[PDB]
Design a protein around this nucleic acid. Structure first.
Length: 107
DNA sequence: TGCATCCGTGAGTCGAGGGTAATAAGTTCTCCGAACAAAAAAATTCCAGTCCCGAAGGACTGGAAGGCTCAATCGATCAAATC
């Protein structure tokens, strides 16, 4: 099996258990690889970060789960990768130049 | 015209048990023919013997293709704090 098939399955791996408390080290058990072999191969194809990749969409899916539902932000930290809200809001201001609170108020 | 003659008829099945018996010659003499014999094929059963893409199979050569340790240094995790 060539390597361009695996990252097609690696992105067919991730988007189904984002509401789960998921990490990179369980991907390496499911893909059988080591913990380090995931992060070299993503740069030949995407030229982005795969360590922050599973952390990017826990903003992007909390950009619709907070947006559609009436969920408050202090349960997003304990499940979607963090421990407190003071770090979750900072990753948003580097990505899309916004704060989480005034992200919904903009119709 | 009888009178005298004769042909052609008569319920249906189960059965229950099988078929007799009379007297009747001899001689030689001789071709028509049998099955056993006893060969003479011809037909099969047997037995090794050369050919040929495959025949269980090993190896080879060849490009491809592979797993996970570290370490300067990035970025962000953690956790007191703080508007």
């Amino acid at each position: 099996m060539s390597h361009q098939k695996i990252i097609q399955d690696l992105i067919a791996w991730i988007d189904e258990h984002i509401d789960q408390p998921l990490n990179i080290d369980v991907v390496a058990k499911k893909s059988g690889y080591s913990k380090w072999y995931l992060q070299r191969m993503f740069r030949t194809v995407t030229h982005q970060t795969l360590g922050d990749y599973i952390r990017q969409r826990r903003l992007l899916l909390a950009a619709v789960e907070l947006r559609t539902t009436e969920r408050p932000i202090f349960d997003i930290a304990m499940d979607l990768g963090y421990v407190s809200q003071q770090t979750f809001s900072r990753v948003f201001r580097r990505q899309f130049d916004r704060t989480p609170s005034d992200y919904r108020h903009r119709l």
